[PDB]
Amino acid sequence: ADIYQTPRYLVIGTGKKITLECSQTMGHDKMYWYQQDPGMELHLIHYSYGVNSTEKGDLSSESTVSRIRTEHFPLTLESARPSHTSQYLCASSEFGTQETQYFGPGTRLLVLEDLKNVFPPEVAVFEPSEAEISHTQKATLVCLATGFYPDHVELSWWVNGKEVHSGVCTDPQPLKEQPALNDSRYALSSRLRVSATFWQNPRNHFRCQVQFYGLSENDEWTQDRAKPVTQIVSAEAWGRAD
Amino acid sequence: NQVEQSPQSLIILEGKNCTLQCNYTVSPFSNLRWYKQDTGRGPVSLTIMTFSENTKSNGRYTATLDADTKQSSLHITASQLSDSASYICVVSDRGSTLGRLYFGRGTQLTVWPDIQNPDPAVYQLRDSSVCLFTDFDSQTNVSQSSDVYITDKCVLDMRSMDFKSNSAVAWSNKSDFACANAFNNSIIPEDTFFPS
Amino acid sequence: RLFPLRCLQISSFANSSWTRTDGLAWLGELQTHSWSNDSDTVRSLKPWSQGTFSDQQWETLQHIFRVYRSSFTRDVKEFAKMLRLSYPLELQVSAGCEVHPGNASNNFFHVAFQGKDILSFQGTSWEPTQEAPLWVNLAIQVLNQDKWTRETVQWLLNGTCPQFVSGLLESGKSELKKQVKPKAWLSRGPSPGPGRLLLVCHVSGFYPKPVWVKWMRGEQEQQGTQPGDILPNADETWYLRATLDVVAGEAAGLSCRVKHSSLEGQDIVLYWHHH
Amino acid sequence: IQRTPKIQVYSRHPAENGKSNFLNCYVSGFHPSDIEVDLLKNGERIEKVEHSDLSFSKDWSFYLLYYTEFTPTEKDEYACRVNHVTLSQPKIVKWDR
């Protein structure tokens, strides 16, 4: 029992219809919707006291919410707009001696004029340096997602079928491949560091995986290249004896 | 904004202590709370306290309220890399769900590693074109570049052997781009290992 | 004799923008304070209204009230949303205590919505009225979350009220004992027949309120006396009017016995007819 | 609109034509608190009427006292007109001396 939001990220064309889903499997009665433009404090857009109560904070937002089951409190934009780009955060609260607030993972919404230039990643994996292996007795692996738009992505390492967390580094933010351009593409790097043995033993399999958040089966794609859709692009490498 | 915080941001070495500040004008004041927001995630409530309190604790985190002067403070102890986040201070004006909550803009905390055994080096890697700068204390700073892409520094933690290291990556589409030349726009320690 | 403090509040919300809260206090029958929407302090009405409290004590009290009025207002507007009630709303509170001989005291705090009881304060908590609507149970839940308000209401009723009412009693001492003699006379109203007459026995200008009037045949209590409402005068005396539906002339001759307290015994008895 | 006002008109002292007196109009047992009350000389509204503070009784219904200083003659009729959401035409009660 937690609190959830889908989707994690969302790219959408202007004028169309957005619905951000929020779900709560704790018992809580009260819920809130916040809007967090980057570098700014949490602004409150709607709240509800429980089933059938849906109020607004602030005199501005054009969004509407509904509450008909305790567990669902979904946000809706009737016709998207560039001005709607933001992070959106959903939360609930309880009593049983003081109040306590529980927040969801949130949604990154980006709204464009037309998604004609959305692009999936191209992943490549790079193999540990020999000098590094002898000098330090360790081995660094570099993964490299490149050429994607928008900057809506999750990267992960898989060693021998299983996902790993220890020894990993990933850029907190993706870097613009052509800065000073509004419709620019992005890249992103990640490291994985392991023992002198672990790499050399040739029955060890290292896999880098990138989750891209792109287009849906309802956006009208007309172009000679393949529809840039939500997907997973991946690249891998094998342990090397000498 | 009736809730104000300080400092805007700060940088500490791991294992050190630190203290953050929150000031408010909210009236009536009923209660106040500290929220840790990791980057890209949702806020997580740490402590809530009233004037009937003066002190709260939650692991290495301790908050203390002075209701008279209208000021709170948050103390982290023996900091860790996992502490790097934005800490938000929020104040409530009722002791029921019948009240508004006011949100501070938040303080940005960045915790860097305490590398005791520096061993600075720039290696080349192959795919089938990528240079890796690595193992340098947090005294070093990596900066950007035109058709060469260089990433910021990034802490990596091998939890098994209790070993932490810093690293940056440079790569380029260009023809002659070489590792001995890659990180020239950054101030790198004059003892770095350039192998082959 | 007994003198309860009674603090009344009258709050009226027509829409969610127009709203007013006016208050007032009575010690016994005498009104001692008043507090209207537009004023940000509490008006005293007797030279001795501050009782025995210091000028700084009286201030921190007025402050508590000031914070309550404004906060009470927003909270109602906000209950309206949660409980789904439609404007106009009418809320009344009646709170106060009564100090008893030998150091004891009891107290109260009842509120009423659209003119019917809905809740009150008991010991430490809010409680619903026997037969109050369903929604009331939610309001109570939300009111009882506020631990600080509960202890403040409790401190005020169990502790502050008794201390204030004690002072008022020895500081408004000579006014609470004042006595004012009435003037009485007889007249003849509209006919309820024919052929019967209406007998009216006026009694004006007495104080305190407790009084006793009846129509007499000598020592014989002639029931069928219709005593009116004891009415107010601007100068804080009272006015009574006792009637008798009768056959003319049985009587004449009849009497009206006025039993007030000053008049320490030698009361006034009037005979039909002298006008 | 729950309870309809009860209006009673009276005077402080036994009226003797051409003597300074007080006229009292008392409205009680009404609900809600929105009310409008006039004292009338002949048929026109008296301008120097002053009232007591709005209060209520144990059963939660409101009451107030309106009064003005006057001098009666055999000439004049005096009245109290009261308006409230519980009655569709303003009620006027006559002063009976």
Q: Could you give the 3-state DSSP secondary structure of residue C18?
A: coil
Contact present, C76 and C69 (Cβ < 8 Å): no
Query: Shortest CA distance to A128 belongs to which of A206, A187, A57, A65?
Result: A206
Resolution (angstroms) stands at 3.1
Which residue segment(s) compose the domain that A2 sits in? 1-113
Final residue of a structural domain among C131, C154, C177: C177
CATH number at residue C185: 2.60.40.10
Ramachandran region, residue C148 (left: φ > 0; alpha: ψ -120 to 50; beta: rest): alpha
Final residue of a structural domain among C144, C177, C210: C177
Q: What is the largest CA-CA distance in chain B?
A: 69
CATH number at residue D76: 2.60.40.10
Alpha helices (H) in chain A, listed in sequence order: 130-136, 196-200
Binary contact (C145, A53; C-beta < 8 A)? no
Shared domain check, C152 and C186: no
Helix (H) or strand (E) holding C76: helix C57-83
Q: Is A6 at the interface with chain B, CB within 8 A?
A: no
Final residue of a structural domain among C177, C198, C213: C177
Binary contact (A103, B134; C-beta < 8 A)? no
Q: Could you give the 3-state DSSP secondary structure of residue A133?
A: helix
D residues 12-71 lying closer than 8 A (beta carbon) to C:
12-14, 22, 24, 26, 28, 31-34, 52-56, 60-61, 65, 67
Q: How far does D43 lie from chain C, in Å, by closest CA? A: 23
- Angle of helix C57-83 versus helix C136-144 axis, rounded to 10: 140
Which residue segment(s) compose the domain that D20 sits in? 1-97
| Residue A79 CA: distances (Å) to CA of A19, A89, C54 | 11, 20, 64
Per the annotation, binding residues of C for a D-galactosylceramide are 75, 146-149
Subunit partners of chain D (3 or more CB pairs within 8 A) = C
Pairwise CA distance, residues A207 & A152, whole Å: 20
Pairwise CA distance, residues A165 & A92, whole Å: 30
Shared domain check, C137 and C21: yes
Pairwise CA distance, residues D16 & D31, whole Å: 36
Contact present, B99 and B46 (Cβ < 8 Å): no
User: What are the b/e assignments for A110-129, b being 16+ CB within 10 Å?
Assistant: bbbeebeebebbebbbbbbb
Q: Which site among B31, B93, B94 would you substitute to test the C interface, given the most C Cβ atoms closer than 10 Å to its Cβ? A: B94
Shared domain check, C66 and C184: no
Query: Shortest CA distance to B117 belongs to which of A172, A200, A137, A142?
Result: A137
Q: Could you give the 3-state DSSP secondary structure of residue A89?
A: strand
Distance of CA B89 to the CA centre of its chain: 17
Pairwise CA distance, residues C24 & C22, whole Å: 7
Shared domain check, A180 and A96: no
Shared domain check, C49 and C99: yes
Contact present, C23 and C10 (Cβ < 8 Å): yes
For chains A and C, what is the number of CB pairs under 8 angstroms? 10
Residue type, C100: H
Number of folded domains that form chain A: 2
- CB-closest option in B121, B154, B156 to A171: B154
Which residue segment(s) compose the domain that C264 sits in? 178-275
- CB-closest option in C34, C115, C231 to D60: C115
Chain C residues with CB under 8 Å of A49 CB are 81-82
Q: Is C205 at the interface with chain D, CB within 8 A?
A: yes
Shared domain check, C264 and C161: no
Q: Which site among C81, C137, C138, C148 would you substitute to test the A interface, given the most A Cβ atoms closer than 10 Å to its Cβ? A: C81
Q: What tokens appear for A198 in the block?
A: 């672990």
CA torsion angle A176 B85 B14 B59 (round to 10): -160
Q: Do B and D touch, counting CB pairs below 8 Å (3 needed)?
A: no
DSSP secondary structure string for all residues of C101-161: SSS-EEEEEEEEETTEEEEEEETTEEEE-TT--STHHHHHHHHHT-HHHHHHHHHIIIIIH
Binary contact (B126, A127; C-beta < 8 A)? yes
Residue type, B188: I
Whose structure tokens read 């889903």?
A21
Binary contact (A125, B127; C-beta < 8 A)? yes
Pairwise CA distance, residues A190 & A209, whole Å: 11
Pairwise CA distance, residues A214 & A12, whole Å: 9
DSSP secondary structure string for all residues of chain B: --EEEE-SEEEEETT--EEEEEEE--SS--EEEEEEE-TTS--EEEEEE-TT-S-EEETTEEEEEETTTTEEEEEE-S--GGG-EEEEEEEESSSSTTS-EEE---EEEEEE---SS---EEEEEB---EEEEE---TT--------EEEPPPEEEEETTTTEEEEEEEEEESSSS--HHHHTTTS---TT-B---
Burial class (CB in 10 A: 0-12, 13-18, 19+), C4: middle
Q: What are the beta bridge partners of residue A30?
A: A93
Q: Do D and C touch, counting CB pairs below 8 Å (3 needed)?
A: yes
Pairwise CA distance, residues C2 & C106, whole Å: 12
Contact present, C40 and C59 (Cβ < 8 Å): no
Give every CB contact of residue C1 below 8 A, 6+ residues apart in sequence. Answer: none
Question: Kindly report the CA angle at C252 between C246 and C255, in degrees rounded to 5?
Answer: 85
Pairwise CA distance, residues C210 & A166, whole Å: 89
Number of folded domains that form chain C: 2
Segment C128-135 long-range contacts (CB within 8 Å, at least 24 positions apart): C135/C83, C135/C84, C135/C85
Domains and CATH numbers, chain B: 1-113 (2.60.40.10), 114-196 (2.60.40.10)
Segment D88-96 long-range contacts (CB within 8 Å, at least 24 positions apart): D91/D5, D91/D7, D92/D40, D93/D7, D93/D8, D93/D9, D93/D25, D94/D9, D95/D9, D95/D10, D95/D11, D95/D23, D96/C189, D96/C190, D96/D9
CATH number at residue A19: 2.60.40.10
| Residue B117 CA: distances (Å) to CA of B32, B94, B113, B120, B166 | 43, 53, 11, 10, 12
DSSP A84: G
